[PDB]
Coordinates of C-alpha atoms in Angstrom, one line a residue:
Chain E
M29 CA -42.2 57.1 -138.4
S30 CA -43.4 54.6 -141.0
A31 CA -42.4 51.1 -142.1
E32 CA -44.0 48.7 -144.3
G33 CA -42.9 45.6 -146.2
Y34 CA -42.6 41.8 -146.1
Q35 CA -40.5 40.4 -143.3
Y36 CA -39.0 42.9 -141.3
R37 CA -37.5 43.7 -137.6
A38 CA -38.1 47.5 -137.0
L39 CA -37.0 48.3 -133.8
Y40 CA -37.4 52.0 -133.0
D41 CA -35.3 52.1 -129.8
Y42 CA -35.2 54.9 -127.1
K43 CA -33.7 53.7 -123.8
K44 CA -32.1 55.8 -121.0
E45 CA -30.6 54.0 -118.4
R46 CA -28.1 54.0 -115.3
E47 CA -26.5 50.5 -114.9
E48 CA -24.0 50.1 -112.2
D49 CA -21.7 47.4 -110.2
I50 CA -22.9 44.3 -112.1
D51 CA -20.9 40.7 -112.0
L52 CA -21.8 38.3 -114.5
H53 CA -20.1 35.0 -115.4
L54 CA -21.1 32.7 -118.4
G55 CA -19.1 29.6 -118.3
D56 CA -17.2 27.7 -121.0
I57 CA -18.4 25.1 -124.1
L58 CA -17.0 21.9 -124.9
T59 CA -18.1 19.6 -128.0
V60 CA -16.5 16.3 -128.0
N61 CA -16.9 13.7 -130.9
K62 CA -16.0 10.1 -130.6
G63 CA -16.6 7.3 -133.4
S64 CA -16.8 7.2 -136.9
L65 CA -19.0 10.2 -138.9
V66 CA -20.6 10.1 -142.2
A67 CA -22.0 13.1 -143.3
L68 CA -23.8 13.5 -146.7
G69 CA -25.6 16.5 -149.0
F70 CA -26.3 19.6 -146.8
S71 CA -25.4 18.0 -143.7
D72 CA -22.7 19.2 -141.4
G73 CA -21.0 16.4 -139.6
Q74 CA -19.9 18.8 -136.6
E75 CA -19.9 22.4 -137.6
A76 CA -18.5 24.3 -134.7
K77 CA -17.7 27.8 -135.2
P78 CA -16.1 29.6 -131.7
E79 CA -17.0 33.2 -131.9
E80 CA -15.9 35.0 -128.6
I81 CA -16.5 38.8 -128.6
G82 CA -16.4 41.2 -125.8
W83 CA -18.6 44.4 -125.8
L84 CA -20.9 44.7 -128.7
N85 CA -22.0 48.0 -129.0
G86 CA -22.5 48.1 -132.9
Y87 CA -23.0 45.8 -135.4
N88 CA -22.1 42.1 -136.1
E89 CA -22.6 39.6 -138.9
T90 CA -21.1 36.2 -138.8
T91 CA -22.8 34.8 -142.0
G92 CA -22.4 31.3 -143.2
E93 CA -23.7 31.1 -146.7
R94 CA -23.1 27.6 -147.8
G95 CA -24.8 26.3 -150.9
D96 CA -26.3 28.1 -154.3
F97 CA -27.3 31.6 -153.8
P98 CA -28.7 33.7 -156.8
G99 CA -30.0 37.3 -156.5
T100 CA -31.6 39.5 -158.9
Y101 CA -32.4 43.5 -158.6
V102 CA -34.9 44.7 -161.0
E103 CA -36.1 48.4 -161.0
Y104 CA -37.8 50.1 -163.3
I105 CA -37.7 54.3 -163.1
Chain N
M4 CA -38.3 58.3 -141.0
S5 CA -39.3 55.6 -143.5
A6 CA -38.6 52.2 -144.3
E7 CA -40.0 49.5 -146.8
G8 CA -38.8 46.7 -148.5
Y9 CA -38.8 42.7 -148.3
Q10 CA -36.5 41.5 -145.6
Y11 CA -35.1 44.2 -143.8
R12 CA -33.7 44.9 -140.4
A13 CA -33.9 48.6 -139.8
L14 CA -33.3 49.2 -135.8
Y15 CA -33.3 53.1 -135.3
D16 CA -31.4 53.5 -132.2
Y17 CA -31.6 56.2 -129.4
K18 CA -30.0 55.2 -126.5
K19 CA -28.5 57.1 -123.6
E20 CA -26.6 55.5 -120.9
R21 CA -24.4 55.7 -117.8
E22 CA -22.7 52.5 -117.4
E23 CA -20.3 51.6 -114.4
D24 CA -17.9 49.1 -112.8
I25 CA -18.8 45.9 -114.9
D26 CA -17.2 42.7 -114.3
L27 CA -18.0 40.1 -116.8
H28 CA -16.0 36.6 -117.4
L29 CA -16.9 34.7 -120.6
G30 CA -15.0 31.3 -120.3
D31 CA -13.5 29.1 -122.8
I32 CA -14.3 27.0 -125.7
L33 CA -12.7 23.3 -126.9
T34 CA -14.1 21.1 -129.7
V35 CA -12.4 17.6 -129.8
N36 CA -12.7 15.3 -132.9
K37 CA -11.7 11.5 -132.1
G38 CA -12.4 8.9 -135.2
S39 CA -12.7 8.5 -138.5
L40 CA -14.7 11.1 -140.6
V41 CA -15.9 11.4 -144.0
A42 CA -17.7 14.7 -145.4
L43 CA -19.7 14.6 -148.5
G44 CA -21.5 17.7 -150.3
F45 CA -22.6 20.7 -149.0
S46 CA -21.3 19.2 -145.5
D47 CA -18.4 20.5 -143.2
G48 CA -16.9 17.8 -141.3
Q49 CA -15.8 20.1 -138.3
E50 CA -15.8 23.6 -139.5
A51 CA -14.5 25.6 -136.5
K52 CA -13.9 29.5 -137.4
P53 CA -12.3 31.2 -133.9
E54 CA -12.8 34.9 -133.8
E55 CA -11.9 36.6 -130.9
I56 CA -12.5 40.2 -130.7
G57 CA -12.8 42.7 -127.9
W58 CA -14.8 46.1 -128.0
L59 CA -17.1 45.9 -131.0
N60 CA -18.1 49.7 -131.2
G61 CA -18.5 49.5 -135.2
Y62 CA -19.0 47.1 -137.9
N63 CA -18.1 43.6 -138.3
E64 CA -18.7 41.0 -141.1
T65 CA -17.2 37.3 -140.8
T66 CA -18.7 36.2 -144.2
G67 CA -18.5 32.5 -145.1
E68 CA -19.8 32.1 -148.7
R69 CA -19.2 28.6 -150.0
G70 CA -20.7 27.6 -152.7
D71 CA -22.1 29.1 -156.0
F72 CA -23.2 32.6 -155.7
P73 CA -24.8 34.8 -158.8
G74 CA -25.8 38.2 -158.7
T75 CA -27.9 40.4 -161.2
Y76 CA -28.5 44.3 -160.8
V77 CA -30.8 45.7 -163.1
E78 CA -32.1 49.1 -163.3
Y79 CA -33.7 51.2 -165.6
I80 CA -33.9 55.2 -165.5
Chain L
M1 CA -34.2 59.3 -143.6
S2 CA -35.6 56.9 -146.0
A3 CA -34.7 53.4 -146.8
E4 CA -36.1 50.7 -149.3
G5 CA -34.9 47.4 -151.1
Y6 CA -34.6 43.9 -150.8
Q7 CA -32.6 42.6 -147.8
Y8 CA -31.2 45.2 -146.1
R9 CA -29.6 46.2 -142.4
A10 CA -30.3 49.9 -142.0
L11 CA -29.2 50.6 -138.5
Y12 CA -29.7 54.5 -137.8
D13 CA -27.5 54.9 -134.8
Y14 CA -27.7 57.4 -132.1
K15 CA -26.1 56.8 -129.0
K16 CA -25.0 58.9 -126.0
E17 CA -23.0 57.1 -123.3
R18 CA -20.6 57.4 -120.3
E19 CA -18.9 54.1 -119.6
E20 CA -16.5 53.4 -116.9
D21 CA -14.3 50.8 -115.1
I22 CA -15.0 47.7 -117.2
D23 CA -13.0 44.6 -116.5
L24 CA -13.8 41.7 -119.1
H25 CA -12.4 38.4 -119.4
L26 CA -13.0 36.2 -122.4
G27 CA -11.1 32.9 -122.3
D28 CA -9.7 30.6 -124.9
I29 CA -10.3 28.5 -127.9
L30 CA -8.9 24.9 -128.6
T31 CA -9.9 22.7 -131.6
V32 CA -8.5 19.2 -131.8
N33 CA -8.5 16.6 -134.3
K34 CA -7.6 13.0 -133.9
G35 CA -8.1 10.6 -136.8
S36 CA -8.1 10.1 -140.3
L37 CA -10.4 12.4 -142.2
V38 CA -11.9 12.7 -145.7
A39 CA -13.6 15.9 -147.0
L40 CA -15.4 16.0 -150.5
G41 CA -17.2 18.5 -152.3
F42 CA -18.0 21.8 -150.8
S43 CA -16.9 20.4 -147.6
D44 CA -14.6 21.6 -145.4
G45 CA -12.7 19.2 -143.0
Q46 CA -11.5 21.6 -140.1
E47 CA -11.7 25.2 -141.5
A48 CA -10.5 27.1 -138.3
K49 CA -9.5 30.9 -139.2
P50 CA -8.1 32.6 -136.0
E51 CA -8.9 36.4 -136.0
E52 CA -8.0 38.1 -132.8
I53 CA -8.9 41.9 -132.9
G54 CA -8.8 44.5 -130.0
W55 CA -10.9 47.6 -130.2
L56 CA -13.0 47.7 -133.7
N57 CA -14.4 51.4 -133.9
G58 CA -14.6 51.1 -137.7
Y59 CA -15.2 48.5 -140.1
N60 CA -14.0 44.8 -140.4
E61 CA -14.5 42.1 -143.2
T62 CA -13.3 38.8 -143.1
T63 CA -14.8 37.4 -146.2
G64 CA -14.2 33.6 -147.4
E65 CA -15.9 33.6 -150.7
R66 CA -15.2 29.8 -151.6
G67 CA -16.7 28.7 -155.0
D68 CA -18.2 30.0 -158.2
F69 CA -19.1 33.9 -158.0
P70 CA -20.4 35.7 -160.9
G71 CA -21.9 39.2 -160.6
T72 CA -23.5 41.6 -163.6
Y73 CA -24.4 45.2 -163.2
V74 CA -26.7 46.4 -165.5
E75 CA -27.8 50.1 -165.8
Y76 CA -30.0 52.1 -168.2
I77 CA -30.0 55.7 -167.8
Chain Q
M2 CA -30.7 60.7 -146.0
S3 CA -31.9 58.0 -148.6
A4 CA -30.9 54.1 -149.6
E5 CA -32.1 51.6 -151.7
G6 CA -30.8 48.6 -153.2
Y7 CA -31.1 44.6 -153.1
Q8 CA -28.6 43.6 -150.1
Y9 CA -27.2 46.3 -148.5
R10 CA -25.7 47.2 -145.3
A11 CA -26.2 50.9 -144.5
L12 CA -25.4 52.0 -141.1
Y13 CA -25.8 55.7 -140.3
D14 CA -23.6 56.1 -136.9
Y15 CA -23.9 58.8 -134.6
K16 CA -22.1 58.2 -131.4
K17 CA -20.9 60.5 -128.6
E18 CA -19.3 58.5 -125.6
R19 CA -16.9 58.7 -122.8
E20 CA -15.2 55.5 -122.2
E21 CA -12.5 55.1 -119.3
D22 CA -10.4 52.6 -117.4
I23 CA -11.3 49.6 -119.1
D24 CA -9.2 46.3 -118.6
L25 CA -10.2 43.3 -121.2
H26 CA -8.5 40.1 -121.8
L27 CA -9.2 37.7 -124.7
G28 CA -7.0 34.5 -124.4
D29 CA -5.4 32.5 -127.1
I30 CA -6.0 29.9 -129.8
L31 CA -4.8 26.3 -130.4
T32 CA -6.0 24.2 -133.6
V33 CA -4.2 20.8 -133.3
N34 CA -4.5 17.9 -136.3
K35 CA -3.3 14.5 -135.9
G36 CA -3.8 12.0 -138.5
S37 CA -4.2 11.4 -142.1
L38 CA -6.4 13.9 -143.9
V39 CA -7.3 13.9 -147.5
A40 CA -9.5 17.0 -148.8
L41 CA -11.0 17.1 -152.1
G42 CA -13.0 19.8 -154.3
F43 CA -14.0 22.9 -152.6
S44 CA -12.8 21.4 -149.3
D45 CA -10.2 22.8 -146.9
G46 CA -8.4 20.4 -144.7
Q47 CA -7.3 22.9 -142.0
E48 CA -7.6 26.2 -143.5
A49 CA -6.5 28.2 -140.3
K50 CA -5.5 32.4 -141.1
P51 CA -4.4 34.2 -137.9
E52 CA -5.1 38.0 -138.1
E53 CA -4.1 39.6 -134.9
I54 CA -4.7 43.3 -135.2
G55 CA -4.9 46.0 -132.6
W56 CA -7.1 49.4 -132.7
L57 CA -9.1 48.9 -135.8
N58 CA -10.3 52.4 -136.2
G59 CA -10.7 52.7 -140.1
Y60 CA -11.4 49.5 -142.8
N61 CA -10.3 46.3 -142.8
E62 CA -10.9 43.5 -145.5
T63 CA -9.2 40.2 -145.2
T64 CA -10.7 38.7 -148.5
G65 CA -10.2 35.2 -149.4
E66 CA -11.5 34.9 -152.9
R67 CA -10.9 30.9 -154.1
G68 CA -12.6 29.7 -157.0
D69 CA -13.9 31.2 -159.8
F70 CA -15.2 34.9 -160.3
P71 CA -16.5 36.5 -163.2
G72 CA -17.8 40.1 -163.0
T73 CA -19.6 42.3 -165.6
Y74 CA -20.3 46.2 -165.5
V75 CA -22.8 47.2 -168.0
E76 CA -24.0 50.9 -168.2
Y77 CA -25.9 52.8 -170.9
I78 CA -26.2 56.7 -170.5
Chain G
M6 CA -30.3 -3.1 -168.4
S7 CA -29.8 -1.0 -165.4
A8 CA -30.0 3.1 -165.0
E9 CA -29.8 5.1 -162.0
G10 CA -28.9 9.0 -161.4
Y11 CA -30.2 12.2 -161.0
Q12 CA -31.6 14.0 -164.3
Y13 CA -31.2 11.4 -167.1
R14 CA -32.8 10.5 -170.4
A15 CA -32.4 7.0 -170.9
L16 CA -33.9 6.0 -173.8
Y17 CA -33.8 2.1 -174.6
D18 CA -34.6 1.9 -178.5
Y19 CA -35.8 -1.4 -180.2
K20 CA -37.4 -0.4 -183.6
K21 CA -38.0 -2.5 -186.5
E22 CA -40.1 -0.6 -189.4
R23 CA -40.9 -0.7 -192.9
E24 CA -41.8 3.0 -194.2
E25 CA -42.9 3.8 -197.8
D26 CA -43.9 6.4 -200.2
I27 CA -44.0 9.5 -197.9
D28 CA -44.6 13.1 -199.0
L29 CA -43.9 15.7 -196.2
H30 CA -43.5 19.4 -197.0
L31 CA -42.6 21.6 -193.9
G32 CA -42.7 25.4 -195.1
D33 CA -40.5 28.5 -194.4
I34 CA -39.8 30.7 -191.4
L35 CA -39.6 34.6 -191.5
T36 CA -38.6 36.8 -188.6
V37 CA -38.9 40.5 -189.0
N38 CA -37.7 43.5 -186.8
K39 CA -38.8 47.0 -187.4
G40 CA -38.0 49.6 -184.8
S41 CA -35.2 50.7 -182.2
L42 CA -34.5 47.9 -179.7
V43 CA -32.2 47.9 -176.6
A44 CA -31.2 44.8 -175.0
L45 CA -29.6 44.5 -171.8
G46 CA -28.3 42.1 -169.4
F47 CA -28.7 38.3 -170.2
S48 CA -31.5 39.6 -172.9
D49 CA -31.0 39.0 -176.4
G50 CA -32.5 41.5 -178.8
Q51 CA -33.6 39.0 -181.6
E52 CA -31.4 35.9 -181.3
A53 CA -32.1 33.8 -184.6
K54 CA -30.0 30.9 -185.4
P55 CA -31.0 28.9 -188.8
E56 CA -30.1 25.4 -188.8
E57 CA -31.1 23.3 -191.7
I58 CA -30.2 19.7 -191.5
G59 CA -31.5 17.1 -194.0
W60 CA -31.7 13.2 -193.0
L61 CA -30.5 13.0 -189.1
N62 CA -29.5 9.7 -188.4
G63 CA -26.8 10.2 -185.7
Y64 CA -25.9 12.9 -183.2
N65 CA -26.5 16.7 -183.2
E66 CA -25.5 19.4 -180.8
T67 CA -26.2 23.1 -181.4
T68 CA -24.9 24.5 -178.2
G69 CA -25.1 28.0 -177.4
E70 CA -23.4 28.5 -173.8
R71 CA -23.5 32.3 -173.5
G72 CA -22.4 33.3 -169.7
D73 CA -20.2 32.0 -167.0
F74 CA -19.7 28.2 -166.9
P75 CA -17.6 26.5 -164.0
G76 CA -17.1 22.9 -163.9
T77 CA -15.1 20.9 -161.3
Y78 CA -14.6 17.1 -161.8
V79 CA -13.4 15.5 -158.2
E80 CA -12.9 11.6 -158.0
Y81 CA -11.3 9.5 -155.2
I82 CA -10.1 5.9 -156.1
Chain K
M24 CA -34.6 -3.9 -166.8
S25 CA -34.2 -1.6 -163.9
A26 CA -34.3 2.3 -163.3
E27 CA -33.9 4.6 -160.0
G28 CA -33.3 8.2 -159.6
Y29 CA -34.7 11.6 -159.2
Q30 CA -36.0 13.3 -162.4
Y31 CA -35.4 10.5 -165.2
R32 CA -37.1 9.8 -168.5
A33 CA -36.5 6.2 -169.3
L34 CA -38.5 5.2 -172.5
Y35 CA -38.1 1.5 -173.1
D36 CA -39.1 1.3 -176.6
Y37 CA -40.3 -1.9 -178.8
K38 CA -42.0 -0.7 -181.8
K39 CA -42.7 -2.9 -185.1
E40 CA -44.4 -1.2 -187.8
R41 CA -45.4 -0.8 -191.2
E42 CA -46.3 3.0 -192.6
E43 CA -47.3 3.5 -196.0
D44 CA -48.1 6.4 -198.2
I45 CA -48.6 9.5 -195.9
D46 CA -48.6 13.0 -196.9
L47 CA -48.1 15.6 -194.8
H48 CA -48.1 19.4 -194.9
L49 CA -47.0 21.5 -192.0
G50 CA -47.2 25.4 -193.0
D51 CA -44.8 28.4 -192.2
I52 CA -44.1 30.5 -189.4
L53 CA -43.8 34.5 -189.3
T54 CA -42.9 36.7 -186.5
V55 CA -43.1 40.4 -186.8
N56 CA -41.9 43.3 -184.4
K57 CA -43.0 46.8 -185.0
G58 CA -42.0 49.1 -182.3
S59 CA -39.4 50.5 -179.8
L60 CA -38.3 47.3 -177.4
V61 CA -36.4 47.4 -174.2
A62 CA -35.1 44.2 -172.8
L63 CA -33.7 44.0 -169.0
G64 CA -32.2 41.4 -167.1
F65 CA -32.9 37.6 -168.1
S66 CA -35.3 38.8 -170.6
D67 CA -35.3 38.1 -174.2
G68 CA -36.8 40.9 -176.6
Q69 CA -37.6 38.4 -179.4
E70 CA -35.5 35.3 -179.1
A71 CA -36.3 33.1 -182.4
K72 CA -34.3 30.3 -183.4
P73 CA -35.1 28.8 -186.7
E74 CA -34.4 25.0 -186.8
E75 CA -35.6 23.2 -189.7
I76 CA -34.5 19.7 -189.8
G77 CA -35.9 16.7 -191.8
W78 CA -35.9 13.1 -190.9
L79 CA -34.7 12.7 -187.3
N80 CA -34.0 9.2 -186.5
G81 CA -31.2 9.7 -184.0
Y82 CA -30.4 12.3 -181.4
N83 CA -30.8 16.1 -181.5
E84 CA -29.8 18.8 -179.0
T85 CA -30.5 22.7 -179.6
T86 CA -29.5 23.9 -176.1
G87 CA -29.3 27.4 -175.5
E88 CA -27.5 27.7 -172.0
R89 CA -27.7 31.5 -171.0
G90 CA -26.4 32.6 -167.7
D91 CA -24.4 31.4 -164.8
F92 CA -23.6 27.4 -165.1
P93 CA -21.6 25.8 -162.4
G94 CA -21.5 22.0 -161.9
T95 CA -19.4 19.7 -159.3
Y96 CA -18.7 16.0 -159.7
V97 CA -17.8 14.4 -156.2
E98 CA -17.0 10.5 -156.2
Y99 CA -15.8 8.4 -153.5
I100 CA -14.8 4.7 -154.4
Chain A
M9 CA -39.1 -4.6 -165.4
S10 CA -38.3 -2.3 -162.3
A11 CA -38.6 1.4 -161.8
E12 CA -38.5 3.7 -158.6
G13 CA -37.5 7.3 -157.7
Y14 CA -38.9 10.6 -157.5
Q15 CA -40.5 12.4 -160.6
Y16 CA -40.0 10.0 -163.7
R17 CA -41.5 8.8 -166.6
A18 CA -40.8 5.6 -167.6
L19 CA -42.9 4.5 -170.7
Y20 CA -42.6 1.1 -171.5
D21 CA -43.6 0.8 -175.1
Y22 CA -44.8 -2.2 -177.0
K23 CA -46.5 -1.1 -180.4
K24 CA -47.4 -3.5 -183.5
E25 CA -49.2 -1.1 -186.1
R26 CA -49.9 -1.1 -189.8
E27 CA -50.7 2.5 -190.9
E28 CA -51.5 3.6 -194.3
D29 CA -52.8 6.4 -196.7
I30 CA -52.8 9.3 -194.0
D31 CA -53.4 12.9 -195.3
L32 CA -52.5 15.4 -192.4
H33 CA -52.4 19.4 -193.0
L34 CA -51.2 21.6 -190.0
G35 CA -51.4 25.0 -190.9
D36 CA -49.1 28.0 -190.1
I37 CA -48.2 30.3 -187.3
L38 CA -47.9 34.3 -187.0
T39 CA -46.9 36.2 -184.2
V40 CA -47.4 40.2 -184.5
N41 CA -45.8 42.8 -182.1
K42 CA -47.4 46.3 -182.6
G43 CA -46.1 49.0 -180.0
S44 CA -43.4 49.8 -177.6
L45 CA -42.5 47.0 -175.0
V46 CA -40.7 46.9 -171.9
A47 CA -39.4 43.5 -170.2
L48 CA -37.7 43.3 -167.2
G49 CA -36.2 40.8 -165.1
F50 CA -37.0 37.2 -165.6
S51 CA -39.3 38.4 -168.5
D52 CA -39.1 37.7 -172.0
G53 CA -40.7 40.2 -174.0
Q54 CA -41.6 38.0 -177.4
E55 CA -39.7 35.1 -177.3
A56 CA -40.6 33.0 -180.3
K57 CA -38.4 29.8 -181.4
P58 CA -39.6 28.3 -184.6
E59 CA -38.8 24.7 -184.8
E60 CA -40.0 22.8 -187.8
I61 CA -38.9 18.9 -188.0
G62 CA -40.5 16.5 -190.0
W63 CA -40.3 12.7 -189.3
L64 CA -39.1 12.6 -185.5
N65 CA -38.1 8.7 -184.7
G66 CA -35.7 9.3 -182.2
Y67 CA -34.5 11.7 -179.7
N68 CA -35.2 15.6 -179.7
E69 CA -34.2 18.1 -177.3
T70 CA -35.0 22.0 -177.5
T71 CA -33.5 23.2 -174.0
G72 CA -33.6 26.7 -173.3
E73 CA -31.9 27.3 -169.9
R74 CA -31.8 30.8 -168.9
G75 CA -30.7 31.8 -165.6
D76 CA -28.6 30.4 -163.1
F77 CA -28.1 26.7 -162.9
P78 CA -25.9 24.9 -160.3
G79 CA -25.5 21.1 -160.0
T80 CA -23.8 18.8 -157.5
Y81 CA -23.2 15.1 -157.9
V82 CA -21.8 13.3 -154.7
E83 CA -21.6 9.4 -154.5
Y84 CA -20.0 7.2 -151.8
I85 CA -19.0 3.8 -152.8

């Protein structure tokens, strides 16, 4: 198993578990705004994205790309 | 197994589990705005995307690309 | 198994599981706006996309591309 | 198995599971606007797309492309 | 006299001159290409625009806009 | 006289001159390419714009905009 | 006379001169390429713009903007 490169997160997972009778309770979320609000530039104001998912066993991206996003791929063979 | 490159998330998952009788309760989400709001530039105001999914076992993208997005692919063979 | 490149998420999934009698309760989502709102530029106001899906076992894109999006593919063989 | 390239999500899924007697309850979504609203530019106001799907086992795109979208394919053989 | 703003070239010219018996000789321009040439992407090859003007006393634009050019004007009064 | 702002070139010219019997000789320009040339991406090859002007007393733009050029003006009054 | 701001070149010119019988000789320019050339990315190859002007007394821009150029103006009054 090999990895190289600049900024990478390479988890090599090997887990074997028996997990029984778990009760887990999170709680709720409240965001309140009262009053006059002015937001300027790369500001936000009150950015508030509610994402409620149950049973993540795969892959999830919630990707907010806000701005100016260039990308150049260059390969010589 | 090999990986290289600039900013990558290469998880190599191997998990074998038995998971029984789990009760899990999240809770709710409330966002409130009272008052006069002015948003300018790459600001947001109150951006609030509700995504409720149950049983993610595959792949999910919620991708908000807001702005100016160039992309150039260049390959020499 | 090989991977290279600039910003990639290469998950190599291998999972073998037995999962029984799970009760899971999420909760609800409320977004409220009271008052005069002015949104300018790449702002949003209150962007609020409700996506309720059950049993994601495959692929999902909710892709909001808002703005100016060029793309150039160039390949020499 | 090989992958290269600029910004890619290459999941190589291999999952073998037995999944029984799951009860899962999401909850509902409410978005409220009271008051005078002015939206300008690449703003939104209250963009609110309700997508309720059950049993995603394949592929799904909800793609909102709002703006100016050029694309050039160039290939030399 | 007032100026503000992001990237501006505000010349405030005040010149009072007496200019006599000037002899000025520029010379010529030659561009030669020999050989096989392949140009790809936002490349050029040999872009070679000959502009010969005499006695510029006003305004001149030779503007080569090659590509993808969006522009949005937004004004609230 | 006032100036502010981000990246500006504000020349405030006041010049009063007597300029007599000047002989000035520039010389010529030759660009030669021999051989096989391949240009890829935002490359150029041999970009070679010949601009010969005599007696610039006003304004001149030779503007090569090659690529992807968005612009957003946003003003609240 | 006032100036402020981030990166500015504010020349406040006041010049009063008598300039007589000047002989000035520049010389010529030759660029030669022999051989196989490959240029990739934001490379150039041999970019070679010949600009021969005589008697610049005003303003001149030779502006090569090659790439991805966003600009956002935002002003609240």
